[PDB]
Amino acid sequence: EADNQIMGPSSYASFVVRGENLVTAVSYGRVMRTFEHFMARIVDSPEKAG
Amino acid sequence: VEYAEYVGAVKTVASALQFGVDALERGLINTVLSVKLRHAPPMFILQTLA
């Protein structure tokens, strides 16, 4: 083998229902992943397309 | 999301205990009113007896 070991992650990339998704979990029952990135895309400058 | 359910679970038991102690100050007044209503001979007897 060219290499004997690979460089991988050490822990699970966690995801918790934080303060913005708790309101829609308790209120609607629809959580999204990375609510802060939806807010960064359509609230804070929606004119900047990714 | 489990602390947000534990909050509702302490609200339920608190509003059941407060229901049970509201229904006893509502039952004490009912007992007082229904024991005033048993030692109350009517007007057409006490207007002559007194």
Å between B14 CA and nearest CA of chain A: 20
Declared resolution, Å = 3.8
**Which chain B residues are Cβ-neighbours of A26 within 8 angstroms?**
4
d(CA B4, CA A29): 13
d(CA A22, CA A31): 8
Q: Name the structure determination technique.
A: cryo-EM
Judge whether A39 and B18 are in contact, CB under 8 Å: no
HEC per residue, A1-50:
CCCCCCCCCCCCCCCCCCHHHHHHHHHCCCCCCCHHHHHHHHCCCCCCCC
Cα-only R_g, chain B:
22
* Crossing angle between the packed helical segments A19-27 and B3-36, to the nearest 10 degrees: 50
Q: Which of A23, A26, A27, A50 is nearest to A38 (CA)?
A: A50
**Which chain A residues are Cβ-neighbours of B4 within 8 angstroms?**
22, 25-26
